[PDB]
Curated annotation (Swiss-Prot), chain A:
Main location: secreted
Keywords, in A-Z order: Amelogenesis imperfecta, Biomineralization, Disulfide bond, Glycoprotein, Hydrolase, Metal-binding, Protease, Secreted, Serine protease, Signal, Zinc, Zymogen
Residue numbers binding Zn(2+): 10, 61
Name of the molecule in the record: Kallikrein-4
Length: 223, 165
């Protein structure tokens, strides 16, 4: 997260850390007690998922859980066209007990509103190219579909939307993949991709447009 | 699901760190730029027996992740993250064929993938970022070993993090 700040601790209790050999490689979002939503490009054959975290050191985070997951389902149209339909559902091996620091979030059914300010959170790179020690939060604003397609055609597809690009240089960055973009109290997007370097004025990042997938998510969780 | 790793077994980073492509059976040689055709500046990539480990590269994907998987489309470039003057592309150039060359512009999504081969990895070029990949191997012409498409005869590399600089 570029030009953000430490999140207030446990203010984003749906945030999930996907860790590999004890190092974070993507985030995800708890959307049901047994399911984490993340970007399909974060797929692995198995996962170790950290819930209830703030720092990434579970041994210093009361209320946290490190949980295993074997099964994941990428959207069937992932990467056709290239980069599009970038979402997957990970089924935890066991349902988690929700608490005030581990809680699912509802998915927006309405699509993004151009201009609206939203919140993105993650443990990815800071402006200085270092990794933060605790979860970072920043606001970014949704950009119109006209601007998103002008900047990203031929790779813009409506399973995506753009946010950010302000003079404020607030953005997501590498290591924020799969984490949440919250708009108006609901999960609206997942961090997906963008032009490098992060935080360029006039260049928004691209997020998975989850309003397009509410039926596939519900059906997958219920099957 | 396969993560590309360096010679220490650590995941290769998305753009942030540089690495040498060390041939598994040519550790004595390393990547360099050379002239091709009638060009006056060296723009083709060769494996040069006088430089080891050769010019380091960075692997870049637009995805907001800091590791690289064998399935990702990549740009490969020489030089610092901040510069796009060293970006690889594959260009028809007689009599080499489809030669690896550098240029100073870069698409959001590059046309290469790094795929496991033998004891290390091969570079595969996908024209138009389609489904069919062409292996990058060596073409010997003009006393030089050009990196170029040589499908079925890839140059196999291991990837060494460039922490000697
Ligand atoms: Cl080595
Ligand atoms: Cl000529």
């Amino acid at each position: 997260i570029i030009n953000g700040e430490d999140c207030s601790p446990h203010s984003q209790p749906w945030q999930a850390a996907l860790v590999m050999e004890n190092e974070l490689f993507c985030s995800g979002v708890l959307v049901h007690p047994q399911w984490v939503l993340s970007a399909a490009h974060c797929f692995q054959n198995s996962y170790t998922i950290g819930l209830g975290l703030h720092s990434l050191e579970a041994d210093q985070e009361p209320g946290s859980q490190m949980v295993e997951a074997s099964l994941s389902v990428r959207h069937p149209e992932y990467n056709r066209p290239l980069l599009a339909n970038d979402l997957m559902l990970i089924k935890l091996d066991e349902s988690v007990s929700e608490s005030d620091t581990i809680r699912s979030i509802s998915i927006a059914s309405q699509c993004p509103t151009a201009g609206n300010s939203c919140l993105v959170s993650g443990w990815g790179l800071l402006a200085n190219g270092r990794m933060p020690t605790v979860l970072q939060c920043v606001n970014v604003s949704v950009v119109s579909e006209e601007v998103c397609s002008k900047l990203y055609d031929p790779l813009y597809h409506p399973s995506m939307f753009c946010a950010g690009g302000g003079q404020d240089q607030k953005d997501s960055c590498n290591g924020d993949s799969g984490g949440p973009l919250i708009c108006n109290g609901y999960l609206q997007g997942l961090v997906s991709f963008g032009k490098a370097p992060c935080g360029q004025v006039g260049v928004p990042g691209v997020y998975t447009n989850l309003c397009k997938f509410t039926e596939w998510i519900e059906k997958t969780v219920q099957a | 699901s396969s993560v590309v790793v360096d010679t220490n077994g650590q995941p290769v980073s998305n753009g942030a760190d540089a690495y040498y492509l060390v041939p598994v059976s040519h550790g004595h040689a390393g990547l360099a730029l050379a002239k091709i055709g009638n060009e006056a500046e060296p723009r083709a990539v060769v494996l040069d027996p006088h430089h080891r480990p050769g010019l380091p590269v960075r692997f870049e994907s637009p995805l907001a992740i800091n590791i690289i998987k064998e399935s990702y489309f990549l740009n490969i470039k020489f030089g610092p993250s901040s510069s796009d003057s060293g970006v690889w592309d594959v260009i028809q150039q007689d009599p080499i064929g489809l030669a690896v060359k550098v240029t100073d512009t870069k698409s959001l999504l590059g046309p290469f993938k790094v795929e496991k081969e033998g004891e290390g990895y091969k570079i595969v070029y996908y024209p138009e970022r389609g489904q069919t990949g062409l292996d990058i191997g060596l073409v010997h012409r003009n006393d030089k070993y050009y990196l170029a498409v040589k499908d079925g005869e890839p140059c196999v590399f291991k990837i060494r993090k460039a922490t000697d600089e």
